[PDB]
Structures are given as C-alpha cells and as structure tokens.
Design a protein around this ligand. Sequence first.
Ligand SMILES: CC(=O)N1c2cccc(O)c2NC2=C(C(=O)CC(C)(C)C2)[C@@H]1c1ccc(Cl)cc1Cl
Ligand SMILES: [Mg+2]
Length: 557
Amino acid sequence: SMSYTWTGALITPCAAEESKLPINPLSNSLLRHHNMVYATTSRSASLRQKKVTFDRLQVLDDHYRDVLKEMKAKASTVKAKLLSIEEACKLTPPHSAKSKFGYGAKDVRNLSSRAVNHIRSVWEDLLEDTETPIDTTIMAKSEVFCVQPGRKPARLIVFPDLGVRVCEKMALYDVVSTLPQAVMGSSYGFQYSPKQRVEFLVNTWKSKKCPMGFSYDTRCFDSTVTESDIRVEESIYQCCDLAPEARQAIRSLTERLYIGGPLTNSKGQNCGYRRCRASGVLTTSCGNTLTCYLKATAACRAAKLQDCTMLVNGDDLVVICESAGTQEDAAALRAFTEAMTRYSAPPGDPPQPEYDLELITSCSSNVSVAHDASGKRVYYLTRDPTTPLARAAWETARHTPINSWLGNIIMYAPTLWARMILMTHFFSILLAQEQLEKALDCQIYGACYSIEPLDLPQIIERLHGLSAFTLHSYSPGEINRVASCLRKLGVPPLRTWRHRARSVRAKLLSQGGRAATCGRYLFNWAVRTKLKLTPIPAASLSGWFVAGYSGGDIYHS
Ligand SMILES: CC(=O)N1c2cccc(O)c2NC2=C(C(=O)CC(C)(C)C2)[C@@H]1c1ccc(Cl)cc1Cl
Ligand SMILES: [Mg+2]
C-alpha cells in the first residue's frame, strides 16, 4: 500500500509567502551573506510529494512480537485522565489555525460560546461515529535554511480541524504526556533537559567496557509508518485505565483520523489520500517515539547487539553498546539496518559505527568538552550553528510567531555561539527598542512557551546551573566549526561579538534590577575583571521536560 495517493490538486498557500531574506539593517549586522538564507514555500511542495510518496513493505518477526508484549505490559501499569474542555482549551496556542466553522484560536482560549458548542458537538460525534474519515488540511511549511554547496523542498504539515485538535487533548494529553516514559523508562528522550541528556550519554558511554555508538536516520519516518504500526500504537494506549468516553474517543480518532484519511488543500479541493502518519496531531511525537523504540529494540535483538542502551526522540535514535571489533560492528550494523528495513523503517544515510562520543550526532547535536570556573572538564550539548543563525537573522528582519533564537539560547545556553552571538545580538536589539520587559513565544520539544527574556538568567540557572555562565576553554573542533560557519555565512567574527557584548553588558547594568542581572551573568565572559556569580534566589516551572508534543497543538503561559 502507498503512503499517499494524489488527485492532482496543488498544495496551495494562503498568505503571501517569502523565500528571500530581507536586507535589513539589524539582521545585516548579524549576517551578511543574505542570499544564502531562504525560506521554503508552496512552490517546492510537489517535489516533497514525490519524495514522501512510496509503497511500504513490512515483515514482522518474533522479536518484534516480543518487544511489543513487554511494552503493552508496562502500559497496563498506567492510569490516564480526561481533561475538561476548559483545560484542553487553555492548552491551545493563540496562533493556531482557525476552524473551518467560524471561530478561531482566540475564541477557543476565551471559551466563546460558538467554539465550545462546536467542540462539544465534535466530541459527541467522536463517541457516536466509528467510521467516517476525518478530513485533514495539507499545507507546505515555511522554514528557513542556509543553502547547500542545492535547496530543500518545503516539508508538509497535515492537520485536522481546530475543533478536533481540542478533542484530541481532552482524550489524550494525559496519555501522551505519561505513557512513553512508563514504557521506555530511561530511553524516553524528552524526559531530559540538555544537561540531563549529556549526563545520560556520558554515563552510558563510560559504563560500557568498550563502547561503540551510532545514530540511525530513517528515510521519511512519517510515510514509512504503516496502518499496522498505528494500530499497534493504539493497542498500547488501550492498556491504560481510561474513562469510557476517552477509550471510545481513542478508538474513533484512530479509525477516523490516525490510520489515514482524505486530504484537502488550502482552497478546499480534494487533494489526495493518506495512509501513514499525520504530522500535525497530538499523537505524532508519542506515536513515533513508540513505533521507533519498538522497531529498534527488535532489530537490536535480530542483530544480536550486546548491552544496548538507546535514547529515542520521535524518529531520532541513538544507540550505545559493546564493541566487538570494527568488522563485526560494521556487520552487526548492516544486520540491524536490514532488520529495520523489514519493519518499514529503512535508513536514509547508512548508519555509521562511531568510537568517540563527541563524533555522534543525534537530534542535530553532539556532546563537547569545555572547562568550568574551577577548571574541571565539563561536557555540554552543542550543534552546528548554521541553521540556528540563519533563523536568528530571519526572525530579526521579520516578525514571526515562534522565536527559534530563544529556544536555542535556552537549549544551547552553554555553547560558544549561543553566548557570544545569540545573546549579544538579541539583547542589543531588544535594548535598542525597549522591548526587554516584553514576552516572546518560542518552543521546547514541540510545546509552545511564552517567556520574558529578562528571566533568562533564572531559566538558564535552573536548566544548566551557574556553570553555563562560566564555561571556557572550548575545544578546537567546536571553535573551528563555529568559526568556519561564521565565514560561510558572513557573520562577523567572535572578536567583534566580544566588543559588542561589552557594550550591551555595560548598558544593561545601568538599567538596574532584572536587566542589570542579565548583564552580570550572561556577559561575565566579556570582561577580564570578572564578577563573582552566586545563585539567583528568584530562580526557585514544572512540566518543561516531560514529553515531546511536536505537531500537537500545545501551549504554556
Ligand atoms: C522537534 C524538537 O522539538 N527538537 C528537535 C529534535 C530533533 C532535531 C532537532 O534539531 C530538534 N530541534 C530543536 C528542538 C527544540 O527544543 C528547539 C530548538 C530551537 C533547540 C530546536 C528539539 C530538540 C533539540 C535538541 C535535542 Cl538533543 C532534542 C530535541 Cl527534541
Ligand atoms: Mg529521518
């Protein structure tokens, strides 16, 4: 069976779509080579359609059967709980797609009579109708990138109506936030903050007698997900104690929505049909994470890998284990890939055995080493800064509803590029405009958070600890990568950023209060006569690294 069938209707935009980066004074002082930055659009959608459309062989074996049964068994341990409409509503981010049926995201969060009446009716419908496919929209995605020495086609979101998305939360938020950890325990990626993730990868690695590690990338995880997979994923949810309306809701949502369904474009036209995973549902992150864990664990047994530890974030997989020598590790990996391929999880690039942890790239990121204030070697998470920087330049020239620079500052607070460039740049900009006290939207692990940047000292301390304000003496690889990247992009050199930082730092300090605190902590690296950094009393919220809600419709004020 095919991943998608197409009518011929085009994937259509609905606002103006912009591909080229603007030539803006502020972003130009962050990034010069402005032609290199682009945003994907609806014009390349038909390219992605050909990539994402293919037939899917799947052969299941006894290993796959057995992991499944271990998984279900851990799931029957869990008890889930219905959200009230009010709770489900207050989870909806204010810039969600409006409904076909009048009301929009504001009307949901404000509980207007129209929206709630439609939601109630959609809920009633989900309990009463078992079979009618639920319609979805298919839109291209605008995401910015830096060019290749070619250019990526847009990715495609597939999401059901707002009224439906609220109902998903009512019947599944508590499941999707709770069951993945119950099943995979320490393997569940999204329970970890960056610090925590490094702790885990370092521990695991150093506990191995002779460690080998690899990450595995599968072609199009969403299109490779067959309806069988989506059923298995249901059968796991159904091991929970669930109120009877939720059980019935999960049953209808699976049949009607998740297993596949009709696709409409922006203009209302019949577009095609879906038989794999929808990228824009509340169960996409959790479902993927589960399908993935399951297939990888079976393949590990098939491939006879020894002492496998693995960490899973949706479709992103990393595995550390006992080396048996280069030949047989290569051969084991070949077996693992072939086992995975039978499970309808074929690999993009063939996975590569790796004998040093710093060389393992996983969720775009790797561990690196630096030194804290004491001089102790300290491991932290980093990535290549090219894409983060492009999006920073783009979010500078254009107002956008998610600020990836703010997610990158918070996630990569202890990186060289985050500290010298990112912070320096945006505090300068915000300070210019007096918008410092003002709140901004960004996202961690798919869920959307509102954040005042002035609270960055306190947030960083709680996630990373004061160490992040004093890491120094970075590795040469990291410095080289960062530096080669700044030249590629025409981003001014770190030298320049230090000079700028000194000026931001001085100006914040004059402001006093919370701003002066940003100045002392964030920029203590810019001065030689350094300030002593004790904890911030104020820095003493909960669900920040619980689960991953990518594609869900999730918000936190
Ligand atoms: C989809 C998703 O939420 N993640 C993800 C997963 C895999 C690759 C990847 O690049 C990302 N990216 C990001 C993520 C952010 O939190 C925001 C931000 C800005 C750090 C980017 C996030 C992520 C980043 C680093 C790691 Cl180690 C894991 C994850 Cl899930
Ligand atoms: Mg992939």
